[PDB]
Amino acid sequence: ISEPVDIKYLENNQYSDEGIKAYEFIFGEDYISSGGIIATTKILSDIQLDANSKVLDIGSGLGGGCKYINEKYGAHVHGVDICEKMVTIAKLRNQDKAKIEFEAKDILKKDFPESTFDMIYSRDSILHLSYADKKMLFEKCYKWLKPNGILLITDYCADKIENWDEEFKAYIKKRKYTLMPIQEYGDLIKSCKFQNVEAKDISDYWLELLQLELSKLEEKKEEFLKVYSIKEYNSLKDGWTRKIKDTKRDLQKWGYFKAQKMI
Numbered sequence: 563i564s565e566p567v568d569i570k571y572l573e574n575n576q577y578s579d580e581g582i583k584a585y586e587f588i589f590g591e592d593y594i595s596s597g598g599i600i601a602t603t604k605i606l607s608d609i610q611l612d613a614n615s616k617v618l619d620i621g622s623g624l625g626g627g628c629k630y631i632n633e634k635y636g637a638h639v640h641g642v643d644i645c646e647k648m649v650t651i652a653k654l655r656n657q658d659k660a661k662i663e664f665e666a667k668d669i670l671k672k673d674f675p676e677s678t679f680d681m682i683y684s685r686d687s688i689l690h691l692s693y694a695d696k697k698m699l700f701e702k703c704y705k706w707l708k709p710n711g712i713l714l715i716t717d718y719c720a721d722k723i724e725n726w727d728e729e730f731k732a733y734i735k736k737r738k739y740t741l742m743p744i745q746e747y748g749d750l751i752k753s754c755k756f757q758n759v760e761a762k763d764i765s766d767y768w769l770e771l772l773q774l775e776l777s778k779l780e781e782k783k784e785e786f787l788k789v790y791s792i793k794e795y796n797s798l799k800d801g802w803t804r805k806i807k808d809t810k811r812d813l814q815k816w817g818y819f820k821a822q823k824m825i
């Protein structure tokens with residue numbers, strides 16, 4: 563590992579208990595990333611799997627994606643997340659599902675046998691890894707996939723650094739994200755031998771999601787304050803305000819990546 567993820571920093575900041583619950587409010591139950599179940603439905607709309615398939619979710623969070631994939635396809639699903647408190651919640655909320663497993667571990671410390679998974683799936687999680695660690699992860703993913711297996715990712719991406727301003731640099735620093743442009747990210751995946759690579763800019767869709775997420779939040783302000791704090795309310799509102807502004811100027815981007823292991 564080049565740059566270990568700062569687990570304690572994450573737990574104390576972006577993924578505080580209060581922060582996680584605030585994300586669930588804005589995205590919907592079981593989700594802490596863009597679009598919640600809405601985006602998940604769209605992202606998986608072309609994917610075909612069955613009850614005998616095996617899927618890895620890298621950065622499984624509270625388990626929404628795993629629940630969805632298992633519900634839609636009946637697949638065996640294995641979610642990995644570095645954050646143990648999340649994994650604990652994911653387990654507690656999915657005790658009914660024999661084909662869903664969650665594991666608390668840094669994905670970079672996981673080893674899976676060659677040809678384990680029909681699909682490797684990751685939603686806004688790889689942004690936590692340094693460039694070198696992204697590359698190491700993609701090389702592992704290539705090994706872990708079955709022949710013809712699919713890698714399917716959404717992730718935050720960015721413009722070149724010379725166009726970053728102080729407020730954007732501050733956000734990146736606060737989040738400990740490592741972002742890069744979409745086509746560079748696609749190139750990294752290609753360099754690991756993946757074929758049929760698609761590296762697509764879905765920022766227009768991202769903006770659609772952000773706008774409705776924010777308007778619903780503001781409509782429900784008084785309700786939010788009954789259960790959660792004004793601090794978390796303003797954190798969400800200001801955070802979405804800046805994401806909307808920064809995607810409109812092409813600074814913060816949403817990338818979609820699909821690739822296939824071909825022998």
Ligand SMILES: C[S@@+](CC[C@H](N)C(=O)[O-])C[C@H]1O[C@@H](n2cnc3c(N)ncnc32)[C@H](O)[C@@H]1O
Pocket residue numbers: 567592593594595596620621622623624626627642643644645648667668669670684685686687688690691
């Ligand atoms: C923005 S959340 C998204 C979670 C989930 N995919 C979702 O859509 O709700 C990013 C997740 O990546 C996880 N994560 C960060 N670094 C990781 C690593 N090295 N290995 C596994 N998970 C990691 C975090 O703990 C967090 O749950």
